[PDB]
Subunit: 316 residues, 6 copies
Amino acid sequence: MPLSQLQDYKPELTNETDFDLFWDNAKALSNQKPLHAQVNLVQDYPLKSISIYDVVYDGADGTPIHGWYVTPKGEHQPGSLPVLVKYHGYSGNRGYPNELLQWASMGMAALAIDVRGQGGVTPDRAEYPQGGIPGWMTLGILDPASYYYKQVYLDCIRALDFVCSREEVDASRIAVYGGSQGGGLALAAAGLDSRPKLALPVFPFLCHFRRSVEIHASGPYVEIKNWFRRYDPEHRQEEQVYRTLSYFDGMNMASRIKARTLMAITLQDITCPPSTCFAAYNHLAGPKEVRLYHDYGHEGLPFHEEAMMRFIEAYL
Amino acid sequence: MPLSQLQDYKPELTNETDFDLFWDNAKALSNQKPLHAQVNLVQDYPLKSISIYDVVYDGADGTPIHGWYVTPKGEHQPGSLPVLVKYHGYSGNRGYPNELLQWASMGMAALAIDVRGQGGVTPDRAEYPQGGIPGWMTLGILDPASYYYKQVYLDCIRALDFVCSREEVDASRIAVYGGSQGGGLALAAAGLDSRPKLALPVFPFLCHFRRSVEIHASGPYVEIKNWFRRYDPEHRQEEQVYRTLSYFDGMNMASRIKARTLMAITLQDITCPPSTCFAAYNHLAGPKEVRLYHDYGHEGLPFHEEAMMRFIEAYL
Amino acid sequence: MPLSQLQDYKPELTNETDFDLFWDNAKALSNQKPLHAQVNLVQDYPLKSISIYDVVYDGADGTPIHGWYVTPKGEHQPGSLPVLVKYHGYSGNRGYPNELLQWASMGMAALAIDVRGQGGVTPDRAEYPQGGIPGWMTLGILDPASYYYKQVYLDCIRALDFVCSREEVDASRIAVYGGSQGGGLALAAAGLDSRPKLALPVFPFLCHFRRSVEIHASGPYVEIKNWFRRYDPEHRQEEQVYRTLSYFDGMNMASRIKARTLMAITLQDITCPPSTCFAAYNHLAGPKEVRLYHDYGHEGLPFHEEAMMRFIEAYL
Amino acid sequence: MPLSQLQDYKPELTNETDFDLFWDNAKALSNQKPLHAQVNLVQDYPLKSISIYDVVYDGADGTPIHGWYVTPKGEHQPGSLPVLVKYHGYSGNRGYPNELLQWASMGMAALAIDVRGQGGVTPDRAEYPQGGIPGWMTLGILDPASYYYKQVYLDCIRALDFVCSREEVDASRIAVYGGSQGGGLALAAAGLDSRPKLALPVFPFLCHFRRSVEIHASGPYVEIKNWFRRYDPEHRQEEQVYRTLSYFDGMNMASRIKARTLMAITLQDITCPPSTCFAAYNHLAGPKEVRLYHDYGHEGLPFHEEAMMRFIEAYL
Amino acid sequence: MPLSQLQDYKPELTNETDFDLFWDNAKALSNQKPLHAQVNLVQDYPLKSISIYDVVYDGADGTPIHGWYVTPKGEHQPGSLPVLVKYHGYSGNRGYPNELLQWASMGMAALAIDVRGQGGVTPDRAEYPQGGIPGWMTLGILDPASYYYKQVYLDCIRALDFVCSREEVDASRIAVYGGSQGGGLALAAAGLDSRPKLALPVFPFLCHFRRSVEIHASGPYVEIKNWFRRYDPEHRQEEQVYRTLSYFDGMNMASRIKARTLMAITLQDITCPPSTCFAAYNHLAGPKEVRLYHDYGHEGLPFHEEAMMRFIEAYL
Amino acid sequence: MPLSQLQDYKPELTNETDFDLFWDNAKALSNQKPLHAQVNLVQDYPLKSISIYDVVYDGADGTPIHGWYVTPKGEHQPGSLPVLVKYHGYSGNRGYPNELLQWASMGMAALAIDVRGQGGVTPDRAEYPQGGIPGWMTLGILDPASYYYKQVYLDCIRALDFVCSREEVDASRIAVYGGSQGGGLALAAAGLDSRPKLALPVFPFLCHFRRSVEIHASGPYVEIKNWFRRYDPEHRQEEQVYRTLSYFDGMNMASRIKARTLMAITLQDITCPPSTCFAAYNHLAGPKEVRLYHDYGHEGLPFHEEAMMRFIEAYL
Ligand SMILES: [Zn+2]
Ligand SMILES: [Zn+2]
Ligand SMILES: [Zn+2]
Ligand SMILES: [Zn+2]
Ligand SMILES: [Zn+2]
Ligand SMILES: [Zn+2]
């Protein structure tokens, strides 16, 4: 897709008429299950200008979700610290505490959590009706009530609960952030919950699934293709598959975001094609900015750090 | 490693002292769990020379294992039919019933089963303490009691319980067969159970783990290397990782096989490298024969089918 | 080409006005040359349900063409058995007798032949006026009377004469099938001869030659571009190259097919692109069905075996 | 090379008798050229807990070398701040000020400089006798006095003079750090200068040149091979090429390092192969530690940040 | 862009209003530096049929440009000999004198020169305000006056002055030739100077710069993309970049060429895309002819030698 | 293999006892069959310093062999011109008359011929008993009397009868030259016939077949490996295959060469590996010289032309 085409690219929403009903039912599941947040301070870490906490809280179905919570060292009044909540890339994990340093040295608290079952210490306790393709995208794909990303989305909202359980945190100054899957999950946390003030998705995955699969996006979108290869080579269940996926689709989530958003889009990206990123961005309901990186694909953006900082200082 | 060294290659066993104890505990756990076999005749399949059953039995933890059970059509006396159990490759499934025809046309019954959680309708109900690398090789890798392949090997022994429960089947004429993961599973079945008379591993996976990994074998062995990359970059838990895997290592299973064995090894194979295949082959306790395909890798072997037919006709 | 355009794609036929006269003359060559069939029962083969014959008969120019002819065991009444003729892929051969087991267990005969000069025991005794590119697609390319595929199309017709010469065979129940080049040869056999009742081409090669070269199909179509590279850099003989190949083109054959046809088309195929396959399917002159496999390329299709067996049970 | 041998690989020093005399003459010539340091406070950076200066100093031939110099915010006591000098990888640059954040938040000053002529605003004003291969590895390669890395190794040392000219900086607590080319530059700086107290090379480039080229390392070592291709196909000038490179070789620089060294070595690295890194490590004249990452090549080492930081805290 | 559109493709010229004034200011400053042309006869080169000279003249900034100059043997009259000047590919050099033998066996003189800085003995003495990407495409890119190909273009013209100052040579029968980079230089040579009678560009590089970058052409055009990556990720300096490059574009030069031009264009070339070559061709102002090699990419064209010889004989 | 042991690598000759008898017999038949050479002068070729002839002679089995025969223009005394015979690379052809110009300008006659069946107008009249792999390496491989290179070798010896039958040629000053397959044919022409004075093989193909195959050389040796994949997966026919190829092997030919030889060997060559070329070099019987190009693979060698020209001046 050429560029002035991408910038007006606004395909029709795929949300089923029961989208909000499905979600507030899923949120009722979460409301009945307490956080039971365990927070243990790490004192053997060499950075020293920040406080580092090892965190675990219960997901809606009892899965213990692990994170790192970091603050500036020193005394903080109740409701004084802004907070950034960071979600991570497909197969990754909470990372190391020092990657939250930038946020803490701006005066902010920050949280990085594991996505259940991925390459960390957080397991996946949900049960699925059938097997799948290596990875997570195809687990429970035939029914949205059992789909892998239902409990993931709920784990991501309960991270906002954890931050607001801390009295030093200012609940009116929450940003959600992430690259790729991380960016998908920030769109969903800002789409499903009212509390986030800013969203900063970078090349978000989990957007416009039908198109992503159709144009042979690389990376984890190929799992959905491999699903059809093994389960349904004539595409007879195609409709059930894309219907299930519509409830988690970032484009549908974007139509319900009122938070101010800064999106980063990379024009040579073949894992999260920019037409899927622009699909979501142009359905954003609140004010928004975009950074277009013409010659970058799915990879590190060291220059984007400073743009995110400016944005946060201006509006958080 | 050159061919004449391949066949003198007999590295030390890595079985811990309690290998047999770990397994007969896991087996006694399976012995308390009835199979609850359900069978259902497929009506209107194009082949009318065979009867085809859609089959489900419970694993030891209650997971419903699906399969296909195929016999020559018509009457058979109790205890008359020899039987072949087929196990499938990594990520695959029970396949299609026409792939078991060959066996039925030789007057045999045959069963193919799903491996739990892979590309089939058979899910994985076991719980793991942590997440993992996409795939199944790293689930529960820190403790053999909770490791993925524990319940897989038990499902595979329970496939022998299923075929032995068929009244038409002759329980003294059972063969176990599979390629790659399939071949590893057939060495497990024959290693952990006395009933199989023949074992037909094709390029068996799950053999000589520490060598597979260190010589940088491609395919699923790479998940173990990626475990290290994410969880343990200085290899401080390498000892626990390879002691977990030793309980499941086909080289240690081979040492308890008394069945007559026909192994295929492909000399250009970078996925199940031939030194790891030879290492298990050179520890087989019973009679054995090998087919060496010099210019083939990890790929379909059209000529091998005939070689297995002759072996089966001669000895089963 | 996008799926909705693909299905309606029906380009102009390239057949020259003397297309049927050429083939009439080429068939008169075949009429001069008797078969001299030799049939020899294969002994000690492990499948005892079937009788397997090792077969040779002469091509029109005298080339000994070898095959496997397989029947159900025991005697059969004159004219009783339906028969399947199998043609193989580019560089392949007659295969192994066990690959025709499925047809015998359905109560049918079957025949698999070598294509002349390819990777079996059947040489190519035709003489060509010039050299060529490695392979067979460019031999004699400047004159259809001397082109590689004339004597090949005639050996394919003579395979049908071989089967009708068998006492047990029913001439009114002949099917022809094959994949890739075999699919092309099946199209040729049904379009040039009236005897075949069914045709089952899978992603057929030798279709819409000028398109297949122009869009840069991989695999053997590349030999034609290489021909221009070596013999005709400026495309001065372009019109004569495409004229020669128009006489062998499956799209032209398909317009003369009255047999009922089941075609498989793989949508990601880059060796036999689907626009070229559909170009033939949409010129077929008899009843037709298509199976379209969205996420497969040029590869094995284990699900298609059952679709073919059903088609043959229904219609042969 | 297998691991235990690799850990003890200590090949013979290639330094000419000349080596210290050559560098004595090059350094004396540099000391005739004032620094002419210019420093400009960056305003309107979003962080605010650090002071950020845009920095330029003269190289020994007048080239204006650019950098970022970063301190914790506020005034500091004379001679109080430890300092980290970071040199960058092949083709890169001084990066972004936020990348020096972690050093500053430990109480340290930090300087990141451009390597002359590579991907930043610092040109290269040195003149060379011939042309060369794209890149910088082959510029002046027939004469050590005109070789690209002579003015580069002097620019790096003059970075130590710029930090020492800052009143806040403690000259007895200097650490030199870098990855790849930067690891190479760090070994040179610590080897040709007596001021660095710590060296932290990550998979250093510019070590054991003759072995690097002849085991066909990837990356910029390829430029040297291409030099032979273009200028000397039969290797008649090879002894002059390797004599030149010997004055720059990290292994020869290591035998002159008395500073305490922490080296990161990647085992699968094919750009800076592990034998070349180990050759240097085993010639280091001071106290040393190694981190050996088995499953990592030429890539980011995020776990390594924590290890450098603990090392800086115990010893800087 | 398909074949019939390619041929008519005549995009708008990008030359700025001051294009002619940029170039007569660059020539003014070239005019003031005398050629200082020196020659030197090579002794026992094995071809005795030809006179072989090792040659050196000064570029406009005193860079000494080395060449091979070849004439038919013995002494010649004043003004008798026609002459062909050959420019070389990206990163290459003057070649070997045997490569000019064919032009000399036609009773011509021939000159092949090094392009400054590339893979020969000729250095580059121009100074640039910043660094660059490895290679030469990005040196001085922000400023037309400081751009790498300014002095290159001037050295290519002064090659003309060198041949025109040899007594044997006939200034009215000058041809300029070369492949890829050489093709672009030949374009610029015949477009900036009145003297060449014939131009023979082969798949010229340095043509239609914006298009070459935007369609992801391989080879050196990718350096301009890597420039934006490293220096300007949001393309805020896109305009100055392409402006600079417009002073050097073959398209703009070709407008001013009144000489007679034979252009080889390769339809599968991904380094020098046929659209950019046809853009330059359809802007030629004098007579022209084209050879369109359909199945050739960026490579040797042994058949094109004869065509160039025919064009020369007929018109030089 | 490392260079020191390459230079002393002289493995065992694989010639059978009947190697000389085989070739005695094939040459006796060849000697009974006249050449019936036709020779027609080419007109309107732009060069003029040369006389060019289109040539055709009969092979020993009746294939018409086509070539180009080139001399200095004008008349010449009987027996006065030395001659170079050029054989081409695999899939190639006689090339263009301008590529012989170099040899003509030295005062020589030059002949380039076609290899039967390859990318020219020369067909292949031989009959083979079986099929093969695409290309010509496998044709007739189970029997030396029918092997493809038997009649090629004889046609190469008949190129010498053709040049000796020309009045102007000096039969005592024949040189045979070629690269890759051409180098193999040069070695066979010098090993089978007594007339050539010089041999100039460049990276000879057709050497030490068993090694080349078993170390996985790319290019046409891969045909022999593909022969085992298709015909003989378990290598039951490996000694018949290598016995056939031993009759054609350049290493065995080299044992019988009396002529003076200049060999170019490329050290990074993966198509014609250097140990296979050294195996031949080290069995040469007469005097010899080598040029080792250390960083070159299977590609053009523009510096080698001059060294060959020096060799020919010195010794022809
Ligand atoms: Zn959707
Ligand atoms: Zn182990
Ligand atoms: Zn056509
Ligand atoms: Zn050295
Ligand atoms: Zn432009
Ligand atoms: Zn041999």
